[PDB]
RNA sequence: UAUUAGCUAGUUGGUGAGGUAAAGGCUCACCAAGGCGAUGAUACAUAGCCGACCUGAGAGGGUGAUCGGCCACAUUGGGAC
RNA sequence: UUGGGCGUAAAGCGAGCGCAGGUGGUUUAUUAAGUCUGGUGUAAAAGGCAGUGGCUCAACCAUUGUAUGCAUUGGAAACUGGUAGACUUGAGUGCAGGAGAGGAGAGUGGAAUUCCAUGUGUAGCGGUGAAAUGCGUAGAUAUAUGGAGGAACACCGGUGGCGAAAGCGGCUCUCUGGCCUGUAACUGACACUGAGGCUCGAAAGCGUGGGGAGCAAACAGGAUUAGAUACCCUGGUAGUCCACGCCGUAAACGAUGAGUGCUAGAUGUAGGGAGCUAUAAGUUCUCUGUAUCGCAGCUAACGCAAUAAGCACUCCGCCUGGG
RNA sequence: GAGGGCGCUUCCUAAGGUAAGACCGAUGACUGGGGUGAAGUCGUAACAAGGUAGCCGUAUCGGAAGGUGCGGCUGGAUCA
RNA sequence: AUGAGCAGGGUGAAGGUGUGGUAAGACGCACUGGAGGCCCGAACCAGGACACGUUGAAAAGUGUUUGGAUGACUUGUGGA
RNA sequence: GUCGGGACCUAAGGCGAGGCCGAAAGGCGUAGUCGAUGGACAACUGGUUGAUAUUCCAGUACUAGAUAUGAUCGUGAUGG
RNA sequence: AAGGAACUCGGCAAAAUAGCCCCGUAACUUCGGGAGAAGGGGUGCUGGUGUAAAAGCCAGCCGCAGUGAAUAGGCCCAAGCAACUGUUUAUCAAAAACACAGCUCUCUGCUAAACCGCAAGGUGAUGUAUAGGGGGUGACGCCUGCCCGGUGCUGGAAGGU
């Protein structure tokens, strides 16, 4: 939910490999971006429950995200806790 | 039986001592606060248990009679030599 | 379990998440955990499969063996598990496309209803099978206009789309998910689920505060007939609408859970991808969609059948004769 | 003198009382529902488009079958 | 209108804060924290009951209990 | 002188020329005027009688003014 | 004494309990409370040791009695009424009476309505319909049914008066 400049910008900073636009770190970038760039829209009127279900499937995408980058990979996130540092 | 949820106070660890045939809160003193439990702990009903044995082709269901083993008991309850 | 069913006969939660828990694309090697082999424990027994003798032979007893996760320990890498390892070839993320009643707010426009005055004229209108209901001569409806307000937005509109469904259609903005077509650019299995817990959610109604056209529970009046507390008519309260909280129950439906694999075809329609048919035309493949017939399969039958009631497996759930 | 029973208090302490429950049974004036039997009486519904097709969840009015309304589906018709 | 007060002691909210709590809130327990027609209870202000007295100490009491006791309190002052 | 008041201000209020209305008396009321329970401000220790003490006096003040005395342009309002 | 409420219309008065600490605490609940529920225990002194910041320990000494006296709740069950706190006849009566938030209706667009005064003037209130005035009822929960004949009120005007 962002333009191509901040899209490819946040790929550019928050990518750990050039061209790795499907990195788990870039899943953190766009997904962990639009959690708080999702909160703007839930606070927009607090009514769009379909977007609340988007938050459900994207919280779950964060669940597979760091459930996997803690799940099979471990230490490339253990060095990278301070990406945002959940929980 | 979860229409059997939260439960547990010596409770759970540590130290000491008494005991014992012996480690052992086995007890008791003192100092620590844990621990269990919604993947069934406690509370209530019910039960002597097992080898075995009747039936079911077997899977099993069902029983514990009589026999043998263990356990428990000795009008009731509790101590202790 | 062996050795069920769930479309209608009893049954799929009312739908979503993403907690445990369950299940695992391919491959390299280890591991032997489980898995198979050998040694070890095994009922004192009594008991079975046999034999012996015998109260004769009987029945059964006495005997004799046989038959056993009762156990622990060497091997097996073929599977799973684990351990390290690799690839994408599932998933998702990239770059291009579009699409829609997807949601949520912020506004706007017209028709139409009813009402305020209103031209100027006379009993009208109502309704049915008809009228009483009634209103209306205080002279109006109807017709001339302007105003007011709420509601909803005919062809658009469709087996159309989107949304998990519930549902969503005047128009315009705001920020807003979700797919599909292509794509390996990239992660390298991140997958599927889903008890628990959580969220959403018809329809009414309930709370507070508004808005109050038309409609209509409650009730009244008039037919109705034996009777009418009903169908009809005249009305007409709650309520319908707006912000703002709740119930959590609907034929929830398709009385057909979720994931993915397989495959006769005749067939709809979307919107892409590609060709395509060229001096403008019009065809073929591909994907998700949603029908209709019907191969196989299929059931008690009815029927289903590519968006299987056919053939499989993982997550769940239900179901046990009736009241 | 030690030690010794008795001398000698305490500890735990069996039973009995206390209080404030909880559980579970029995029990109970009257009373709510349900089933059974009569074949009284009320009624037209539900069954055919079963006489207003319904069937749900819900609000609300009936002696009662039931009605009115919100919305939904054929397990519905003449065929719309 | 201006002033005066109304000993003490509990109670414990809200509020706030911080960590386990959470995507994030709701939650957990601390910490403040006292608001409160809160409570008890002094002064103070009443008068519920009871006894005494009632030609009474008294033209309305005493004595013992009783209530409120930070309020709609009590009440000075000076006014209408 | 210093304590309380007045010679300061002012609430609540009262009186109220003007003015308003009203048989009259009156009652209202602008300016203004008073009106403390309020707000303005210097003195406090010791002794002292039969009795007065912050008042009499020892010690220290301070406030305000006066006339006596090198200013210097300064004061600076009812206004702000 | 012994006995208890048998007295009485009535445990009326007296009695008895209460302090502080520490346990523990049913019912319903509007979830705060109830509740100090109840019921229970302790409470003196001596030396220690730990109490000074600080109880508890140990032993003993004692005691009829250990907040040695004073001072300081009787409790429980249930029902009706009223919610409550407040206020209430001083020279009788404190309550179920009043009041109260609450809820309801109605009236008033402003030199308000309403009210006081002959008026003037002023309140209402330097108020503007969430305010002001009147009427009902008195939290919270459920609910408020029917009847416009009559009365009153409102509104309308055809005619009578």
Short mmCIF file of N, CA, C and O (backbone and C1' of nucleotides) in Angstrom, two decimals, chain F residues 20-22 26-28, chain G residues 117-122:
data_model
loop_
_atom_site.label_atom_id
_atom_site.label_comp_id
_atom_site.label_asym_id
_atom_site.label_seq_id
_atom_site.Cartn_x
_atom_site.Cartn_y
_atom_site.Cartn_z
P C F 20 -39.75 62.95 34.95
"O5'" C F 20 -40.34 61.55 34.49
"C5'" C F 20 -39.56 60.63 33.74
"C4'" C F 20 -39.68 59.25 34.32
"C3'" C F 20 -41.04 58.89 34.88
"O3'" C F 20 -41.92 58.44 33.89
"C1'" C F 20 -39.33 58.20 36.38
P C F 21 -42.95 59.45 33.21
"O5'" C F 21 -44.35 58.72 33.39
"C5'" C F 21 -45.12 58.96 34.54
"C4'" C F 21 -45.21 57.74 35.42
"C3'" C F 21 -46.22 57.84 36.54
"O3'" C F 21 -47.56 57.66 36.13
"C1'" C F 21 -44.20 57.06 37.43
P G F 22 -48.54 58.93 36.13
"O5'" G F 22 -49.31 58.82 37.52
"C5'" G F 22 -50.06 57.66 37.84
"C4'" G F 22 -49.70 57.14 39.20
"C3'" G F 22 -50.34 57.86 40.37
"O3'" G F 22 -51.62 57.35 40.68
"C1'" G F 22 -48.02 57.67 40.74
P G F 26 -43.41 61.36 51.47
"O5'" G F 26 -43.64 59.82 51.81
"C5'" G F 26 -43.10 58.81 50.99
"C4'" G F 26 -44.18 57.99 50.34
"C3'" G F 26 -43.69 56.94 49.35
"O3'" G F 26 -43.33 55.73 49.98
"C1'" G F 26 -45.41 58.22 48.35
P G F 27 -41.80 55.43 50.34
"O5'" G F 27 -41.51 54.03 49.64
"C5'" G F 27 -42.59 53.21 49.23
"C4'" G F 27 -42.63 53.09 47.73
"C3'" G F 27 -41.32 52.71 47.06
"O3'" G F 27 -41.15 51.30 47.06
"C1'" G F 27 -42.51 54.38 45.81
P C F 28 -39.70 50.63 47.04
"O5'" C F 28 -39.23 50.81 45.53
"C5'" C F 28 -38.17 51.69 45.20
"C4'" C F 28 -38.11 51.91 43.72
"C3'" C F 28 -36.76 52.32 43.17
"O3'" C F 28 -35.85 51.26 43.04
"C1'" C F 28 -38.42 53.69 42.23
P G G 117 -47.95 42.16 44.32
"O5'" G G 117 -47.32 43.62 44.42
"C5'" G G 117 -48.07 44.74 43.99
"C4'" G G 117 -47.19 45.85 43.49
"C3'" G G 117 -47.89 46.88 42.62
"O3'" G G 117 -48.65 47.83 43.34
"C1'" G G 117 -45.95 46.17 41.52
P C G 118 -50.23 47.90 43.07
"O5'" C G 118 -50.34 48.17 41.51
"C5'" C G 118 -51.55 47.94 40.81
"C4'" C G 118 -51.97 49.16 40.04
"C3'" C G 118 -51.04 49.58 38.91
"O3'" C G 118 -51.26 48.88 37.70
"C1'" C G 118 -51.55 51.46 40.23
P A G 119 -50.07 48.00 37.07
"O5'" A G 119 -49.05 49.06 36.45
"C5'" A G 119 -49.32 49.72 35.22
"C4'" A G 119 -48.87 51.16 35.26
"C3'" A G 119 -47.38 51.41 35.03
"O3'" A G 119 -47.04 51.51 33.65
"C1'" A G 119 -48.06 52.53 36.99
P A G 120 -45.72 50.80 33.08
"O5'" A G 120 -44.51 51.59 33.75
"C5'" A G 120 -44.19 52.92 33.38
"C4'" A G 120 -43.32 53.57 34.41
"C3'" A G 120 -42.01 52.86 34.70
"O3'" A G 120 -40.97 53.18 33.80
"C1'" A G 120 -43.11 53.27 36.73
P G G 121 -40.12 52.00 33.11
"O5'" G G 121 -39.28 51.35 34.29
"C5'" G G 121 -38.37 52.12 35.07
"C4'" G G 121 -38.13 51.45 36.39
"C3'" G G 121 -37.62 50.03 36.30
"O3'" G G 121 -36.21 49.98 36.18
"C1'" G G 121 -39.49 50.08 37.73
P G G 122 -35.53 48.88 35.24
"O5'" G G 122 -35.66 47.54 36.07
"C5'" G G 122 -35.03 47.42 37.33
"C4'" G G 122 -35.62 46.28 38.13
"C3'" G G 122 -35.44 44.90 37.55
"O3'" G G 122 -34.15 44.37 37.83
"C1'" G G 122 -37.66 45.17 38.33
#
